[PDB]
Amino acid sequence: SKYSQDVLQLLYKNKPNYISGQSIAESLNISRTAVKKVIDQLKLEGCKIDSVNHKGHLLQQLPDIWYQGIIDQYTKSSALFDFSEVYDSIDSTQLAAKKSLVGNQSSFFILSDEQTKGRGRFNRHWSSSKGQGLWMSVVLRPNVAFSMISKFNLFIALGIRDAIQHFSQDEVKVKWPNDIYIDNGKVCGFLTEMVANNDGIEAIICGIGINLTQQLENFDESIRHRATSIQLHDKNKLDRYQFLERLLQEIEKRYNQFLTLPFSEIREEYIAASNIWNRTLLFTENDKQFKGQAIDLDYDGYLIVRDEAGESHRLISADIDF
Amino acid sequence: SKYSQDVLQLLYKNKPNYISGQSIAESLNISRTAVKKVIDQLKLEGCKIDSVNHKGHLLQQLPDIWYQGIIDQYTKSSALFDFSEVYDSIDSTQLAAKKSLVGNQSSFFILSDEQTKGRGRFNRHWSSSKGQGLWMSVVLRPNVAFSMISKFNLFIALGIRDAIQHFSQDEVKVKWPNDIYIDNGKVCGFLTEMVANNDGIEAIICGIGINLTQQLENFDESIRHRATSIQLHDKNKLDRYQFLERLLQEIEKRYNQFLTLPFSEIREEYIAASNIWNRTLLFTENDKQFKGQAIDLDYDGYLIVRDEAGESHRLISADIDF
Numbered sequence A, B: 001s002k003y004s005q006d007v008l009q010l011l012y013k014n015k016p017n018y019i020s021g022q023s024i025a026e027s028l029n030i031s032r033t034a035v036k037k038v039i040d041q042l043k044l045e046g047c048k049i050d051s052v053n054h055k056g057h058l059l060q061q062l063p064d065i066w067y068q069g070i071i072d073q074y075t076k077s078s079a080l081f082d083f084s085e086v087y088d089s090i091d092s093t094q095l096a097a098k099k100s101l102v103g104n105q106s107s108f109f110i111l112s113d114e115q116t117k118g119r120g121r122f123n124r125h126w127s128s129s130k131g132q133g134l135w136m137s138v139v140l141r142p143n144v145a146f147s148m149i150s151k152f153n154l155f156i157a158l159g160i161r162d163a164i165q166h167f168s169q170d171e172v173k174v175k176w177p178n179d180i181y182i183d184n185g186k187v188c189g190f191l192t193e194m195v196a197n198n199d200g201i202e203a204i205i206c207g208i209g210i211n212l213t214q215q216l217e218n219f220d221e222s223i224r225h226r227a228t229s230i231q232l233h234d235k236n237k238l239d240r241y242q243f244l245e246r247l248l249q250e251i252e253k254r255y256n257q258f259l260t261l262p263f264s265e266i267r268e269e270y271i272a273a274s275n276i277w278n279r280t281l282l283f284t285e286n287d288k289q290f291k292g293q294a295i296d297l298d299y300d301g302y303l304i305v306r307d308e309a310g311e312s313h314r315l316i317s318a319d320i321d322f
């Protein structure tokens, strides 16, 4: 109803205390019996609320559904983000962000439970199952030259990687410059884009897709053998809100490093996180394909590649298969 | 009315022939007496239509108002542009373009007779008087690396300059990298922006503002002494449609050169068009200001500057005052 998000927001805000129907009813100026109806419905959606005669209601567990009311709390206490928008289903959080950034300087993010038109690099389809992942776009406003897009993109990778690590029992590695893996399974893809002119960046838009609870059964057969989710490498139920919150904290940590440190300061760290070394790599460059080895990441974040014919290249980006 | 643009489109299309009310009335499936009403109104708006008993109507002159119906003809015959949008008044053709490019690969342009929120570089106010100029944003789709924004921007300048030259009796010069002058008057500003990621440009958006018929009286007093319009340097009435058409042809010529030639091929041409040489220049770089001389434009389009203290800089962009 009209008041669901508001009841939720008050339940979240008052943890680990109970609040009474009465009291929620006075906050929103609505009837006690309307509070009960709203709470009955939150429980049907799979909210876990402890309801005790005489004492009140306590939010114990949120379901796998993003709630604007709750995300409104993540943004209130945030030093980085002016607001967020949350959607059950959208074409793409990246289209939505590129539309929402026009004409303002806000920083914000957009989450959606499903995407019907998720795209990755080179307009590739990005599978965005309802209820099974974090499909997010983040809009930031670094005051910097357009050439710093590539640098942004290196820092945020370690951000994302640390957030996924904290929940997997298995090893989490970056595949430069845009993919994160747990063993041979792709668990996340992200893409950093910018609006800019000669004078500087007007906005960075970082689309980030993280598989959270798909079983292998839930992926499509064309991608199933090289996909995995955080849940398949966690003994405990993975809690999206707990994940989201960890992720926001890392994005913010790496964004500040991004603004303050040269790439040389995180380069060894990135090196030790990467899974592209001592193994043969397939590169696609339009028409051409060619095999190659990753030799080094240089101080400015270019990949140094020795291809199958002994020739050396220095690359700002690539698409690599294994 | 509902059918104005359609009547107009048919009048434009049939030049230099007359078409009869009867015949327009059969094209649109409407009554002869509705055709007369539509034509009476186009004349009130200041269309110049020759109406001859027995023979019909011929469009002689369009007023200083953009008409979707007519611009629909410029796009139909165009090899570059999928469509256009035309507005009597908008916040900014640049905001509109940045919103319209999301989620598609169309190339298009947006014109508006006035802007209420025109912006130039560094969020400066761009005066966009109703009826007195060309306020346009152009969206193109070069398949190229994000670093080619600066190059795009050099080629389009000569495009714009040639289009303004063709109508002024006086000399038209470029002020690198974003301004065109006729004597000491600023007659146009333009700005090239991009949406891009590491893999390439998703879109170029080029905002172009050209003063067409302001009298010096029509500008604001803060800018009046360094502003001019094409009309103040033309003996003949300047015809916006004739201008627009010339401008589209040059944008297209320079866009193809842009796709095909290295900067070195137009560099001398640009040099001879520029007004920044043999004179003292003020540079703004955030906090700092400093005087300097333009020494050369290099083959990659950087300005070589000897500042007042004998130090040399190599600049991709700048804001220069005289």
Ligand SMILES: Nc1ncnc2c1ncn2CCCCn1cc(CCCCC[C@@H]2SC[C@@H]3NC(=O)N[C@@H]32)nn1
Residues within 6 Å of the ligand: A092, A093, A094, A095, A115, A117, A118, A119, A120, A121, A124, A125, A126, A127, A128, A134, A135, A136, A137, A178, A179, A186, A187, A188, A189, A190, A191, A207, A208, A209, A210, A211, A223, A226, A227, A228
């Ligand atoms: N869910 C998946 N898991 C594993 N592999 C997949 C998946 N889907 C398709 N594949 C096959 C592997 C494709 C490999 N791949 C990575 C990438 C970078 C992508 C940016 C992430 C998208 C995020 S989701 C929120 C945002 N909105 C949006 O519209 N996109 C971004 N490009 N290709």
Ligand SMILES: Nc1ncnc2c1ncn2CCCCn1cc(CCCCC[C@@H]2SC[C@@H]3NC(=O)N[C@@H]32)nn1
Residues within 6 Å of the ligand: B092, B093, B094, B095, B115, B117, B118, B119, B120, B121, B124, B125, B126, B127, B128, B134, B135, B136, B137, B178, B179, B186, B187, B188, B189, B190, B191, B207, B208, B209, B210, B211, B223, B226, B227, B228
């Ligand atoms: N009409 C004017 N004529 C002369 N000087 C002016 C004017 N207005 C303000 N000034 C004072 C001089 C400012 C100098 N100056 C140039 C520039 C590049 C600007 C891109 C052009 C804008 C075009 S109009 C269609 C598009 N939509 C949009 O929203 N913007 C673009 N930045 N500052």
